[PDB]
Write a protein that binds this DNA or RNA. Structure first.
Ligand SMILES: [K+]
Ligand SMILES: [Mg+2]
Ligand SMILES: [Mg+2]
Ligand SMILES: [Mg+2]
Ligand SMILES: [Mg+2]
Ligand SMILES: [Mg+2]
Ligand SMILES: [Mg+2]
Ligand SMILES: [Mg+2]
Ligand SMILES: [Mg+2]
Ligand SMILES: [Mg+2]
Ligand SMILES: [Mg+2]
Ligand SMILES: [Mg+2]
Ligand SMILES: [Mg+2]
Ligand SMILES: [Mg+2]
Ligand SMILES: [Mg+2]
Ligand SMILES: [Mg+2]
Ligand SMILES: [Mg+2]
Ligand SMILES: [Mg+2]
Ligand SMILES: [Mg+2]
Ligand SMILES: [Mg+2]
Ligand SMILES: [Mg+2]
Ligand SMILES: [Mg+2]
Ligand SMILES: [Mg+2]
Ligand SMILES: [Mg+2]
Ligand SMILES: [Mg+2]
Ligand SMILES: [Mg+2]
Ligand SMILES: [Mg+2]
Ligand SMILES: [Mg+2]
Ligand SMILES: [Mg+2]
Ligand SMILES: [Mg+2]
Ligand SMILES: [Mg+2]
Ligand SMILES: [Mg+2]
Ligand SMILES: [Mg+2]
Ligand SMILES: [Mg+2]
Ligand SMILES: [Mg+2]
Ligand SMILES: [Mg+2]
Ligand SMILES: [Mg+2]
Ligand SMILES: [Mg+2]
Ligand SMILES: [Mg+2]
Ligand SMILES: [Mg+2]
Ligand SMILES: [Mg+2]
Ligand SMILES: [Mg+2]
Ligand SMILES: [Mg+2]
Ligand SMILES: [Mg+2]
Ligand SMILES: [Mg+2]
Ligand SMILES: [Mg+2]
Ligand SMILES: [Mg+2]
Ligand SMILES: [Mg+2]
Ligand SMILES: [Mg+2]
Ligand SMILES: [Mg+2]
Ligand SMILES: [Mg+2]
Ligand SMILES: [Mg+2]
Ligand SMILES: [Mg+2]
Ligand SMILES: [Mg+2]
Ligand SMILES: [Mg+2]
Ligand SMILES: [Mg+2]
Ligand SMILES: [Mg+2]
Ligand SMILES: [Mg+2]
Ligand SMILES: [Mg+2]
Ligand SMILES: [Mg+2]
Ligand SMILES: [Mg+2]
Ligand SMILES: [Mg+2]
Ligand SMILES: [Mg+2]
Ligand SMILES: [Mg+2]
Ligand SMILES: [Mg+2]
Ligand SMILES: [Mg+2]
Ligand SMILES: [Mg+2]
Ligand SMILES: [Mg+2]
Ligand SMILES: [Mg+2]
Ligand SMILES: [Mg+2]
Ligand SMILES: [Mg+2]
Ligand SMILES: [Mg+2]
Ligand SMILES: [Mg+2]
Ligand SMILES: [Mg+2]
Ligand SMILES: [Mg+2]
Ligand SMILES: [Mg+2]
Ligand SMILES: [Mg+2]
Ligand SMILES: [Mg+2]
Ligand SMILES: [Mg+2]
Ligand SMILES: [Mg+2]
Ligand SMILES: [Mg+2]
Ligand SMILES: [Mg+2]
Ligand SMILES: [Mg+2]
Ligand SMILES: [Mg+2]
Ligand SMILES: [Mg+2]
Ligand SMILES: [Mg+2]
Ligand SMILES: [Mg+2]
Ligand SMILES: [Mg+2]
Ligand SMILES: [Mg+2]
Ligand SMILES: [Mg+2]
Ligand SMILES: [Mg+2]
Ligand SMILES: [Mg+2]
Ligand SMILES: [Mg+2]
Ligand SMILES: [Mg+2]
Ligand SMILES: [Mg+2]
Ligand SMILES: [Mg+2]
Ligand SMILES: [Mg+2]
Ligand SMILES: [Mg+2]
Ligand SMILES: [Mg+2]
Ligand SMILES: [Mg+2]
Ligand SMILES: [Mg+2]
Ligand SMILES: [Mg+2]
Ligand SMILES: [Mg+2]
Ligand SMILES: [Mg+2]
Ligand SMILES: [Mg+2]
Ligand SMILES: [Mg+2]
Ligand SMILES: [Mg+2]
Ligand SMILES: [Mg+2]
Ligand SMILES: [Mg+2]
Ligand SMILES: [Mg+2]
Ligand SMILES: [Mg+2]
Ligand SMILES: [Mg+2]
Ligand SMILES: [Mg+2]
Ligand SMILES: [Mg+2]
Ligand SMILES: [Mg+2]
Ligand SMILES: [Mg+2]
Ligand SMILES: [Mg+2]
Ligand SMILES: [Mg+2]
Ligand SMILES: [Mg+2]
Ligand SMILES: [Mg+2]
Ligand SMILES: [Mg+2]
Ligand SMILES: [Mg+2]
Ligand SMILES: [Mg+2]
Ligand SMILES: [Mg+2]
Ligand SMILES: [Mg+2]
Ligand SMILES: [Mg+2]
Ligand SMILES: [Mg+2]
Ligand SMILES: [Mg+2]
Ligand SMILES: [Mg+2]
Ligand SMILES: [Mg+2]
Ligand SMILES: [Mg+2]
Ligand SMILES: [Mg+2]
Ligand SMILES: [Mg+2]
Ligand SMILES: [Mg+2]
Ligand SMILES: [Mg+2]
Ligand SMILES: [Mg+2]
Ligand SMILES: [Mg+2]
Ligand SMILES: [Mg+2]
Ligand SMILES: [Mg+2]
Ligand SMILES: [Mg+2]
Ligand SMILES: [Mg+2]
Ligand SMILES: [Mg+2]
Ligand SMILES: [Mg+2]
Ligand SMILES: [Mg+2]
Ligand SMILES: [Mg+2]
Ligand SMILES: [Mg+2]
Ligand SMILES: [Mg+2]
Ligand SMILES: [Mg+2]
Ligand SMILES: [Mg+2]
Ligand SMILES: [Mg+2]
Ligand SMILES: [Mg+2]
Ligand SMILES: [Mg+2]
Ligand SMILES: [Mg+2]
Ligand SMILES: [Mg+2]
Ligand SMILES: [Mg+2]
Ligand SMILES: [Mg+2]
Ligand SMILES: [Mg+2]
Ligand SMILES: [Mg+2]
Ligand SMILES: [Mg+2]
Ligand SMILES: [Mg+2]
Ligand SMILES: [Mg+2]
Ligand SMILES: [Mg+2]
Ligand SMILES: [Mg+2]
Ligand SMILES: [Mg+2]
Ligand SMILES: [Mg+2]
Ligand SMILES: [Mg+2]
Ligand SMILES: [Mg+2]
Ligand SMILES: [Mg+2]
Ligand SMILES: [Mg+2]
Ligand SMILES: [Mg+2]
Ligand SMILES: [Mg+2]
Ligand SMILES: [Mg+2]
Ligand SMILES: [Mg+2]
Ligand SMILES: [Mg+2]
Ligand SMILES: [Mg+2]
Ligand SMILES: [Mg+2]
Ligand SMILES: [Mg+2]
Ligand SMILES: [Mg+2]
Ligand SMILES: [Mg+2]
Ligand SMILES: [Mg+2]
Ligand SMILES: [Mg+2]
Ligand SMILES: [Mg+2]
Ligand SMILES: [Mg+2]
Ligand SMILES: [Mg+2]
Ligand SMILES: [Mg+2]
Ligand SMILES: [Mg+2]
Ligand SMILES: [Mg+2]
Ligand SMILES: [Mg+2]
Ligand SMILES: [Mg+2]
Ligand SMILES: [Mg+2]
Ligand SMILES: [Mg+2]
Ligand SMILES: [Mg+2]
Ligand SMILES: [Mg+2]
Ligand SMILES: [Mg+2]
Ligand SMILES: [Mg+2]
Ligand SMILES: [Mg+2]
Ligand SMILES: [Mg+2]
Ligand SMILES: [Mg+2]
Ligand SMILES: [Mg+2]
Ligand SMILES: [Mg+2]
Ligand SMILES: [Mg+2]
Ligand SMILES: [Mg+2]
Ligand SMILES: [Mg+2]
Ligand SMILES: [Mg+2]
Ligand SMILES: [Mg+2]
Ligand SMILES: [Mg+2]
Ligand SMILES: [Mg+2]
Ligand SMILES: [Mg+2]
Ligand SMILES: [Mg+2]
Ligand SMILES: [Mg+2]
Ligand SMILES: [Mg+2]
Ligand SMILES: [Mg+2]
Ligand SMILES: [Mg+2]
Ligand SMILES: [Mg+2]
Ligand SMILES: [Mg+2]
Ligand SMILES: [Mg+2]
Ligand SMILES: [Mg+2]
Ligand SMILES: [Mg+2]
Ligand SMILES: [Mg+2]
Ligand SMILES: [Mg+2]
Ligand SMILES: [Mg+2]
Ligand SMILES: [Mg+2]
Ligand SMILES: [Mg+2]
Ligand SMILES: [Mg+2]
Ligand SMILES: [Mg+2]
Ligand SMILES: [Mg+2]
Ligand SMILES: [Mg+2]
Ligand SMILES: [Mg+2]
Ligand SMILES: [Mg+2]
Ligand SMILES: [Mg+2]
Lengths: 275, 48
RNA sequence: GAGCUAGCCCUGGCCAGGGUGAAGCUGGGGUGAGACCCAGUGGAGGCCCGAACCGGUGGGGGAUGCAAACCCCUCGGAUGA
RNA sequence: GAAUGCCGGCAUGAGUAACGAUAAAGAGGGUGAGAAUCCCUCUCGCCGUAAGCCCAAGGGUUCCUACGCAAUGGUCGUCAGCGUAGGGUUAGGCGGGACCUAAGGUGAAGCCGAAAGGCGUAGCCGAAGGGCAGCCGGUUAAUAUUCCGGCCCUUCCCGCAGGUGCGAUGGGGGGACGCUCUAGGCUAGGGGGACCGGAGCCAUGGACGAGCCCGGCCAGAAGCGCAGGGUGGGAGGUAGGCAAAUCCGCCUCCCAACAAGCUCUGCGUGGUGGGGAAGCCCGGGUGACAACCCCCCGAAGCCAGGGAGCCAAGAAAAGCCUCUAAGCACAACCUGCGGGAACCCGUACCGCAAACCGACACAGGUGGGCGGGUGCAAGAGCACUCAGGCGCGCGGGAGAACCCUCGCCAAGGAACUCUGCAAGUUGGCCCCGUAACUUCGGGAGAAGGGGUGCUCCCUGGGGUGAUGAGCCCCGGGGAGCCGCAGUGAACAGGCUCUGGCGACUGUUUACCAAAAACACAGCUCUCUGCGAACUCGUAAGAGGAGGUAUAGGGAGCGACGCUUGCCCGGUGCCGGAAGGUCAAGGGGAGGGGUGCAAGCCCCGAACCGAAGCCCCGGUGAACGGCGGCCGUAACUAUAACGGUCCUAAGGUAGCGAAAUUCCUUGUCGGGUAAGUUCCGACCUGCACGAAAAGCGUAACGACCGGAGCGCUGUCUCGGCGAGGGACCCGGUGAAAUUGAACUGGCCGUGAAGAUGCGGCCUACCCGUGGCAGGACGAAAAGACCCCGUGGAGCUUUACUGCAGCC
RNA sequence: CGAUGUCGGCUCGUCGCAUCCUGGGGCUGAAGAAGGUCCCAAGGGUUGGGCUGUUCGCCCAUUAAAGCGGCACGCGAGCUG
RNA sequence: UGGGAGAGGGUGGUGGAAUUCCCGGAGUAGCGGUGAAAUGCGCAGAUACCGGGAGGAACGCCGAUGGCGAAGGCAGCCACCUGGUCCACCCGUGACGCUGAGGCGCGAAAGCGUGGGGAGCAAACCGGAUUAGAUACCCGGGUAGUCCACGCCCUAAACG
RNA sequence: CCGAGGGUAGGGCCCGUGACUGGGGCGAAGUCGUAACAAGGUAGCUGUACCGGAAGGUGCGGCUGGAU
RNA sequence: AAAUG
RNA sequence: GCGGGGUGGAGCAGCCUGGUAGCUCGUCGGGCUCAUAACCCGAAGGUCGUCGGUUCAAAUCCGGCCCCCGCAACCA
């Protein structure tokens, strides 16, 4: 439930914030944080390879458990729900009866105090992790592996989910957040429920400085540049595109598809995305 | 105003120094070339 | 060649004083319960005035200069991109 | 003899400009061959959030002493950061290393690349971050947390005693963290004292005083006291912390809970050891047996790893503690005490500057800490001033024009001008009061006004303390006094109305543009299913992201409000197992060369045969496009209406002489005495128009228009005054430029603008202050233009390639 | 073209006369007054403001009158911009 | 007190018919549509038929001249939460009543905001016809919207 | 001290007037169509929404004050 | 399909 | 200066490729209707802006002139 401000500065007029009302613990688990090496969008050559990055708040990286089939049958308790600055979802602290502590991304409805479990035998309950083949058709699910034992790759952003649509051989059929219909292997793990913090989309940044806090540096339009810089550069006064609208590198950017044709995973996609 | 020369011994030794020169085909050519010319100093002097 | 300059990374440092008085909280009124209203408290903000600091708006000077961009008056920002 | 030739030398401009901040000087006495300039004293002025003091960087002997003045020093020089010589930098505790990690760098394993080389986990390197043991005073010409004195402390080695399952590169805990706000108690620092110590002082009308002037501390082990930080104790179970574990994690039980206890800091006290003024007498000595006390103010610093709130969610590693593993338990480790041991480098001096960066002893630039007092509401602002430091390395005169910086001005008051440019005005604080409009925050310091000093009387609350005295902080009321004037000096908004553009705070052409440009939250299209797309790279490898469609890339638009129409013929992009074309390859009808011949060799039709293109569709917040001619209504005009041609379709709403309107100063209205600008309208829009967005919009703007009030030297129209120059004298002494020169006016002439030719006229020789009409004055081999089969950046459906992709 | 800076303003003038005014005239469809028109005359004079960068022009209020031209469309080693 | 009938309201869940789309099969020269046509769809394999899948919206028969609510309005089925109302007994309180300027709440559709959803339908819009014209009626398409959540709007032939 | 009033500054209500602009009323006869009254030749009216030279059209929902 | 006086 | 154009009453074909003027609308006559419109039947109307040339022959091809649209008028 996003929160509004009163117009006591120009920027506060539309600035919104998260309510943070699911968070129960406001410092991370020391054994589970490690330094996040900021990149600036620069690679090992020192070159900007992703433009307009840098200058955001310092962040510790909270280690996340994207396997969960690591500890089959060993139940855990949800000890807290915590802020994670490296992702849109909240993260949940798990206290395994093992005595082991791990983080997972926090599904919608997860309550501090309940218990979660992973495995083929796990009840179909919010927060439990099962192989895709043991989850009933129709279930809304998240943090889905894309290949057996390779780690949760799908549906991890705040409010997202995938829905199990049917089965076919060793493979189940999922509707991804994009609306794509893909075949994923049945032994791939997933977690009953949708990711929480669905109100994330409705946050109004509010002013320029907020983007700067997020490590987002000002983006400048091709149309504002010179021909040395960009296909849209130059012209006397303002100018329309004057050609098919293009990236800085010349490739068309309104409609031109870019997935590889002969990509092997094509055999397992049923329908390109929606809308 | 602030001018271009802002001396800094650590910078000078790291950038132009003997060991920076020897680490690199171009730098070893500088040394070979200043020897062949007979330079008294092969590398900028800096106190450390 | 990035000891100038541009961006980023790591680690430190700095921002006199004064003003405005958001949320929340407490109390009071209110109502079936509410919303909400009042007062007190509170101390938010690319908020306000103004040094340091960072600037460089207008004018005057300077013009084989004090200076290959400087001086004076004035003026912008000054918890933040 | 010429090349704006090259190198050198020497001229001219010229005894000219200048001698580097307008903070400022004067005199006496010394020294010496010589003194405005060196030394000393007195007087004067300047800085004092510095122009004083302390660190770091950079510099590298510049430090101190003696002896010098050729050159260096913008003059001088006996002086100096200059010349010669001698001296000077002392550490277990300060800084760095023999400790740790950060980005980054390097790099056993490993990967990649024609060579050179590029990567890469661990590891290693890497600091102004973590960690770690010294405080106060004395001493030298020059060093001092370094030497000395006092009082403290660390590590290593050996030993003694006591204690314990000892033992690590392994496990674990801790180290360990943001921004804003902030409590309690302290300290640093400061103010006052009728109290304490002190050489003295009584002036000039008064005061011998509860007078003036000066000073009234610093460090400190244990212990103690005050204030804080940190921390639960026990037992049982145990599958997790990549072996083990009694540790840690998890579960249960019992006790304990603002505590206490234990532990660790800060502050106070504390054996002890130090310091100690003015004044006076030559850095010293005396003062002095110096005194060393009370009250108040009080940090941003300390206790600290304190507390609260917030979102953008805030290093690592070692030291250290705990756990066990091989091992070992004669060892080994812990604790206490003792003896011994404790290496390398820096240390002078400048350090907002004459010693650093700017060619200079250069009005510029340079990070951190201290930065006193009073008054002005506060403050690091402003004036003065302390400690301390300076008067800026040419001076002396004169008192012109003109220039700069400054002060004042009769009457008028923007009449100045492109423009109120510039300069006035206003100005802090307290109180009264404050409009359209609005997104209800604001607009707002709106506007506009009143108050402001000093004296006396009365009195309310707060801090410290004691509930009081004193001190300190906020106020309240009454009566008075003086001046032209009470924020009496200094620092400190002129205001309103109305358009354009941009929502806003931000950003930019370092050094002619700060804007309406860029950015911006926000909106839409589009790509991307993760070994993502995209980007960098030959590659490996990276970024994306230790992210996963509520995410990432690309593009346009640019808060918000109300909106964003019609055209898919062309180009683009998306979709389309048909068809047409289509290269290599397959196929091999049928031909050819050669050989006596088996053969060897060549050409080769149909037919099969990708993407691409053709073809069929879709698609506009994809590139883009959104008509012409003729007529028609109460006999005016105009045209709701009609005809016809063309197109893919013919511009919708809204707006409009506009940042767009050519004709144009359109026309009408407003404002003015007068209005090419401005504002409001009209609509024949040369040539608005809907995300290269359309029309609005409160608030915002060193943006660009228009107007008014206030006030002014902007002006009528100029006058006077100040200082720094200009001028004269002494010192030092440039520059561009320069064919040579014995270098006048007119009217002609001349390559068409003549000091230089002709004719006339005028004119004794040489300077100084001034002014700029000429010397087609100087500067720069015109930057406009053309020329060159000269160059370079940029574009595309120019040509031809290449990467990349299919 | 190995450089002759370019509109307007300001400042400072100076010259020409095809004379705007003032002075002297002739003709008049000159009653007077006031004009018209031509002749002579360059001595002096020839205003302040609104608009626009403007020159020019229009306009306001006056005037004896509100002249026109040249001087590198006079004048940037004089200023403005 | 004990009973009753009902699409009264709210939440969650769930069932089948049909339309559309997609994949597979089988199959060929038309389908669709109208007053008649054309646009449109279809040999690139449509329509008609069979199997499978995805998804949205509305609930046939019962059904009525019926029921419920103050009105707007409420219809598959299930469960939960909840309002109104009638009846019998004649038990309890003893006028505690009626109305109601203001106020407060509710209030079809369309409409608006921020999300989501989107099968059918369909303003706008396009195309085919008709017509003198046809910015209509009819036909082929088709965007908001219709649906859900939350918040607004507060209208009506909101009528008996 | 109060004080008629004068003055400066900022507000509120009312009246008159204003380039132009909005629709309204009235004046017999023009131009364009034919929306309504009959099933008015698409039943009408309706609140709303979008559109169009004009009346009007269409969508959603409502009413009968609808014919047969 | 079929407008008007 | 460059490009296009002028043909019954209106708007358009024919021109390129010489012989042949055509389409819609309007105008006139007649129907239908009570009447008008619409609708149906039949008709008339252009010597092709103009003058000159080439040709057997010119709307057509080549010139001159007039007239109407459109583009251009830049460095200065
Ligand atoms: K040019
Ligand atoms: Mg808000
Ligand atoms: Mg609000
Ligand atoms: Mg939350
Ligand atoms: Mg760690
Ligand atoms: Mg990285
Ligand atoms: Mg690297
Ligand atoms: Mg990028
Ligand atoms: Mg970047
Ligand atoms: Mg993220
Ligand atoms: Mg989170
Ligand atoms: Mg799979
Ligand atoms: Mg968003
Ligand atoms: Mg961030
Ligand atoms: Mg941008
Ligand atoms: Mg541009
Ligand atoms: Mg540009
Ligand atoms: Mg470039
Ligand atoms: Mg290029
Ligand atoms: Mg390009
Ligand atoms: Mg372009
Ligand atoms: Mg441009
Ligand atoms: Mg343009
Ligand atoms: Mg541009
Ligand atoms: Mg274009
Ligand atoms: Mg392009
Ligand atoms: Mg897809
Ligand atoms: Mg600089
Ligand atoms: Mg530097
Ligand atoms: Mg260094
Ligand atoms: Mg250094
Ligand atoms: Mg360095
Ligand atoms: Mg550096
Ligand atoms: Mg290097
Ligand atoms: Mg080196
Ligand atoms: Mg080599
Ligand atoms: Mg040598
Ligand atoms: Mg070298
Ligand atoms: Mg640098
Ligand atoms: Mg600040
Ligand atoms: Mg601070
Ligand atoms: Mg205040
Ligand atoms: Mg308050
Ligand atoms: Mg609170
Ligand atoms: Mg601010
Ligand atoms: Mg203020
Ligand atoms: Mg000024
Ligand atoms: Mg200069
Ligand atoms: Mg100043
Ligand atoms: Mg400020
Ligand atoms: Mg010669
Ligand atoms: Mg030469
Ligand atoms: Mg030479
Ligand atoms: Mg020589
Ligand atoms: Mg020479
Ligand atoms: Mg010489
Ligand atoms: Mg000379
Ligand atoms: Mg001279
Ligand atoms: Mg000079
Ligand atoms: Mg000088
Ligand atoms: Mg000065
Ligand atoms: Mg002097
Ligand atoms: Mg003297
Ligand atoms: Mg001497
Ligand atoms: Mg001297
Ligand atoms: Mg001398
Ligand atoms: Mg002197
Ligand atoms: Mg001071
Ligand atoms: Mg030096
Ligand atoms: Mg000398
Ligand atoms: Mg000398
Ligand atoms: Mg000598
Ligand atoms: Mg010298
Ligand atoms: Mg000098
Ligand atoms: Mg020394
Ligand atoms: Mg020591
Ligand atoms: Mg050693
Ligand atoms: Mg290679
Ligand atoms: Mg290193
Ligand atoms: Mg260190
Ligand atoms: Mg140390
Ligand atoms: Mg000595
Ligand atoms: Mg022990
Ligand atoms: Mg921590
Ligand atoms: Mg941490
Ligand atoms: Mg740190
Ligand atoms: Mg923060
Ligand atoms: Mg102390
Ligand atoms: Mg004080
Ligand atoms: Mg165990
Ligand atoms: Mg400490
Ligand atoms: Mg003493
Ligand atoms: Mg501090
Ligand atoms: Mg602390
Ligand atoms: Mg804290
Ligand atoms: Mg690390
Ligand atoms: Mg033994
Ligand atoms: Mg050693
Ligand atoms: Mg030293
Ligand atoms: Mg300075
Ligand atoms: Mg400093
Ligand atoms: Mg110095
Ligand atoms: Mg220099
Ligand atoms: Mg000097
Ligand atoms: Mg003092
Ligand atoms: Mg003050
Ligand atoms: Mg001086
Ligand atoms: Mg003189
Ligand atoms: Mg001065
Ligand atoms: Mg005056
Ligand atoms: Mg006045
Ligand atoms: Mg005035
Ligand atoms: Mg003016
Ligand atoms: Mg102006
Ligand atoms: Mg200007
Ligand atoms: Mg002032
Ligand atoms: Mg004042
Ligand atoms: Mg007003
Ligand atoms: Mg108001
Ligand atoms: Mg106003
Ligand atoms: Mg307004
Ligand atoms: Mg308001
Ligand atoms: Mg005021
Ligand atoms: Mg006084
Ligand atoms: Mg101010
Ligand atoms: Mg802008
Ligand atoms: Mg702006
Ligand atoms: Mg706006
Ligand atoms: Mg700001
Ligand atoms: Mg610039
Ligand atoms: Mg520039
Ligand atoms: Mg430059
Ligand atoms: Mg600005
Ligand atoms: Mg820009
Ligand atoms: Mg903006
Ligand atoms: Mg938007
Ligand atoms: Mg979007
Ligand atoms: Mg690349
Ligand atoms: Mg990564
Ligand atoms: Mg922009
Ligand atoms: Mg509005
Ligand atoms: Mg198109
Ligand atoms: Mg197309
Ligand atoms: Mg097409
Ligand atoms: Mg175009
Ligand atoms: Mg086109
Ligand atoms: Mg007529
Ligand atoms: Mg008439
Ligand atoms: Mg419209
Ligand atoms: Mg107009
Ligand atoms: Mg406009
Ligand atoms: Mg225009
Ligand atoms: Mg115009
Ligand atoms: Mg014009
Ligand atoms: Mg006019
Ligand atoms: Mg007027
Ligand atoms: Mg007009
Ligand atoms: Mg565009
Ligand atoms: Mg444009
Ligand atoms: Mg601004
Ligand atoms: Mg501005
Ligand atoms: Mg004005
Ligand atoms: Mg005025
Ligand atoms: Mg003056
Ligand atoms: Mg003077
Ligand atoms: Mg003389
Ligand atoms: Mg001399
Ligand atoms: Mg000299
Ligand atoms: Mg000669
Ligand atoms: Mg001569
Ligand atoms: Mg001469
Ligand atoms: Mg002469
Ligand atoms: Mg001539
Ligand atoms: Mg001549
Ligand atoms: Mg002569
Ligand atoms: Mg001659
Ligand atoms: Mg001759
Ligand atoms: Mg001669
Ligand atoms: Mg002669
Ligand atoms: Mg003469
Ligand atoms: Mg002289
Ligand atoms: Mg002179
Ligand atoms: Mg001259
Ligand atoms: Mg000259
Ligand atoms: Mg010349
Ligand atoms: Mg000249
Ligand atoms: Mg040359
Ligand atoms: Mg040339
Ligand atoms: Mg040149
Ligand atoms: Mg030529
Ligand atoms: Mg050529
Ligand atoms: Mg040639
Ligand atoms: Mg060329
Ligand atoms: Mg690509
Ligand atoms: Mg020239
Ligand atoms: Mg020359
Ligand atoms: Mg020249
Ligand atoms: Mg007369
Ligand atoms: Mg005259
Ligand atoms: Mg004018
Ligand atoms: Mg002119
Ligand atoms: Mg004009
Ligand atoms: Mg007269
Ligand atoms: Mg003249
Ligand atoms: Mg000239
Ligand atoms: Mg001329
Ligand atoms: Mg001319
Ligand atoms: Mg001139
Ligand atoms: Mg000039
Ligand atoms: Mg000029
Ligand atoms: Mg000149
Ligand atoms: Mg000249
Ligand atoms: Mg077919
Ligand atoms: Mg076929
Ligand atoms: Mg669907
Ligand atoms: Mg009874
Ligand atoms: Mg409603
Ligand atoms: Mg018809
Ligand atoms: Mg909508
Ligand atoms: Mg009076
Ligand atoms: Mg009708
Ligand atoms: Mg009808
Ligand atoms: Mg009809
Ligand atoms: Mg319609
Ligand atoms: Mg019909
Ligand atoms: Mg009619
Ligand atoms: Mg035709
Ligand atoms: Mg033709
Ligand atoms: Mg023919
Ligand atoms: Mg050009």
């Amino acid at each position: 439930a996003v929160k509004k401000f009163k117009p006591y500065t120009p920027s506060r007029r539309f600035m919104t914030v998260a309510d943070f009302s699911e968070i129960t613990k406001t410092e991370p688990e020391k054994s589970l944080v490690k330094p996040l090496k900021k990149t600036g969008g620069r690679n090992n050559q020192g070159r900007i390879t992703v433009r307009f990055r840098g200058g955001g708040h310092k962040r510790l990286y909270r280690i996340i458990d994207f396997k969960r089939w690591d500890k089959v049958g060993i139940p855990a308790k949800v000890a807290a729900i915590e802020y994670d600055p490296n992702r849109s979802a909240r993260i949940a602290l798990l206290h395994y009866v093992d005595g082991e502590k791990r983080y997972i991304i926090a599904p919608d409805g997860l309550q501090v105090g309940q218990q979660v479990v992973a495995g083929p035998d796990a009840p179909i309950q919010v927060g439990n992790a099962l192989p895709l083949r043991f989850i009933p058709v129709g279930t809304v699910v998240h943090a889905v592996e894309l290949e057996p034992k390779k780690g949760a790759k799908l549906a991890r952003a705040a409010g997202t989910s995938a829905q199990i649509q049917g089965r076919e051989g060793d493979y189940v059929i999922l509707r991804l957040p994009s609306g794509e219909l893909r075949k994923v292997h049945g032994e791939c793990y997933a977690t009953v429920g949708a990711v929480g913090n669905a109100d994330h989309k409705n946050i109004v940044l509010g002013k320029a400085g907020r983007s700067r806090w997020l490590g987002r540096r000002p983006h400048v339009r091709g149309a504002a540049m010179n021909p040395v810089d960009h296909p849209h550069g130059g012209g006397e006064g303002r100018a329309p595109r004057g050609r098919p609208p293009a990236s800085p590198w010349g490739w068309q950017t309104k409609g031109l598809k870019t997935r590889k044709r002969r990509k092997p995973s094509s055999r397992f996609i049923i329908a390109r995305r929606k809308k | 105003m602030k001018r271009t020369w802002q001396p800094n011994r650590r910078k000078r030794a790291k950038t132009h120094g003997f060991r920076a020169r020897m680490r690199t085909p171009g730098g070893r050519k500088v040394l070979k070339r200043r020897r062949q010319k007979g330079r008294w100093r092969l590398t900028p002097a800096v106190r450390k």
